[PDB]
């Protein structure tokens, strides 16, 4: 089994740690879901006329 040849094990481990812990995560951080544009038509800090 070529999977047991431990000589090429760093070549398979070092890029993965860059791809899984740096690049894919930097691409998920740039995937953002903004909160809904919910517009409140009820917002009026008013008060009775000056009486």
């Amino acid at each position: 089994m070529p999977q047991l040849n431990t000589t090429v094990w760093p070549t398979m481990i070092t890029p993965m740690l860059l791809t899984l812990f740096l690049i894919t995560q930097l691409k998920m951080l740039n995937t953002n879901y903004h909160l809904p544009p919910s517009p409140k038509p009820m917002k009026m800090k008013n008060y009775n006329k000056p009486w």
Partner: protein, 54 residues
């Protein structure tokens, strides 16, 4: 904006309270004056009429 403009309209209508108060003061004074004149007239005429009736 519409609500604020309506509030301004009511503020513009405010003056009727003081119009009412002034109307009532004037009318009460006039009623009192006329009742006093009728009282003095009635007493004078009433005494003269008691004399004429006896």
């Amino acid at each position: 904006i519409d609500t604020e403009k309506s509030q301004q309209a009511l503020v513009q209508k405010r003056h009727y309270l003081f119009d009412v108060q002034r109307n009532n003061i004037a009318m009460a004074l006039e009623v009192t004056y006329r009742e006093r004149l009728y009282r003095v007239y009635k007493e004078v005429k009433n005494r003269l009429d008691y004399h004429i009736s006896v």
